[PDB]
Amino acid sequence: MNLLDTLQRGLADLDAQGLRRVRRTADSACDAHMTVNGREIVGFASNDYLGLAAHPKLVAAFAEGAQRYGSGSGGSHLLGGHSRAHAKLEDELAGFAGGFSDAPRALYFSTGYMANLAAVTALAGKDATIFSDALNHASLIDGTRLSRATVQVYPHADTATLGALLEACTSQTKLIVTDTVFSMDGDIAPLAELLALAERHGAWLVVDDAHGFGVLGPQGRGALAAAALRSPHLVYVGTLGXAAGVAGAFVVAHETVIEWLIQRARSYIFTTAAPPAVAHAVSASLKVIAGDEGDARRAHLAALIERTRALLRRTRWQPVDSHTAVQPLVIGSNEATLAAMRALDAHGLWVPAIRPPTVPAGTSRLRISLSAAHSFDDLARLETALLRASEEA
């Protein structure tokens, strides 16, 4: 009983702090309009930035992929589970997103969480120093903890400070690690200056483009293509369960880097390869992302972003200066953020509250996440509800 009682007290303490998390259950596919807890809503909670999670081509690819390659991979990519579906997808990803490299190769992972663990731990050992943006994603931070390296945190996007830290650092191996698009803020890292610093100081630059892949850059090729950056120092992590509408993740880097991850990365080696139908569906998604339809979805998303920037600034609260689909509205306390979320729920809209530990204390926020599936009428409803929530506050 004592073990369970300690957890019970912890749960009660979270409740009292306004930090209790509650799952909601979707009864229909992820989409702008969908059924959640048995009610019809307009959803702004998901990361489905291009509206692809419900796309008929991806649905059909699940069926076809399972029919061609079965249900389970049966094991590790290094022990029987590596399918032609995975191999083809790796070739496709290297060709699509590897333009920053003179000798690209891609490596497919079942989750972005584990791709990040692999990139950080394989490249930074006990004598290395990692320099990490203060607002990096949890999986990057877990990667830095698993690695044997010393970890220096630099203030968010503060390249002046990072440069001073790199100059002061005497490690032979240095790694700079950053989100590209920050998951709870929507700003974009200063990638050109970060790369200039990595080249000046002999460091790897590991960039996590989970929220930029598919939505930034020419044909959606991501943040490095948008920034037109090229270097052997770059190690690119993309994920496939956000704008790409399926699941999984990938690392693109110099061929030699990928060889090293295959040989050494524990979160690549010691896990079951994802079902080959999932890879087959990602291959279908990349064709949608890269072509005229992907261009049209990105263009409509950009229009929604313009209108959302305007409507958020009509409230009393402080939006982040974001030009991406991630449109957060900072409210402050946990209680005021939950109250604003509940007010929007009453208008049939789901805009989720975000609270510590995800964001710093005192910066709890609503996270409006836009999708190309959203309409201008959806935003008009969001505007009306937020103005009422703001007036009521």
UniProtKB/Swiss-Prot annotation:
Binding site for pyridoxal 5'-phosphate: 112-113, 183, 211, 239
S-S bonds: none
Alphabetized UniProt keyword annotations: Biotin biosynthesis, Pyridoxal phosphate, Transferase
Binding site residues for substrate: 21, 137, 358
Positions bearing N6-(pyridoxal phosphate)lysine: 242
Record has rRNA-binding as a keyword: no
InterPro entries: Aminotransferase_I/II_large, AON_synthase_class-II, AONS_Archaea/Proteobacteria, AONS_Proteobacteria, PyrdxlP-dep_Trfase, PyrdxlP-dep_Trfase_major, PyrdxlP-dep_Trfase_small
Cofactor: pyridoxal 5'-phosphate
Catalyzed reactions: 6-carboxyhexanoyl-[ACP] + L-alanine + H(+) = (8S)-8-amino-7-oxononanoate + holo-[ACP] + CO2
Single Gene Ontology BP annotation: biotin biosynthetic process
EC number: 2.3.1.47
Pathway it works in: Cofactor biosynthesis; biotin biosynthesis
SUPFAM superfamilies documented for this protein: PLP-dependent transferases (SSF53383)
Record-level Gene Ontology MF annotations: 8-amino-7-oxononanoate synthase activity; pyridoxal phosphate binding
Pfam families: Aminotran_1_2 (PF00155)
Entry function: Catalyzes the decarboxylative condensation of pimeloyl-[acyl-carrier protein] and L-alanine to produce 8-amino-7-oxononanoate (AON), [acyl-carrier protein], and carbon dioxide.
HAMAP family listed in its UniProt record: BioF_aminotrans_2
Subunit structure, as described in the record: Homodimer.
Family stated for the protein in its record: Belongs to the class-II pyridoxal-phosphate-dependent aminotransferase family. BioF subfamily.
Protein name according to UniProt: 8-amino-7-oxononanoate synthase
Protein source organism: Burkholderia multivorans (strain ATCC 17616 / 249)
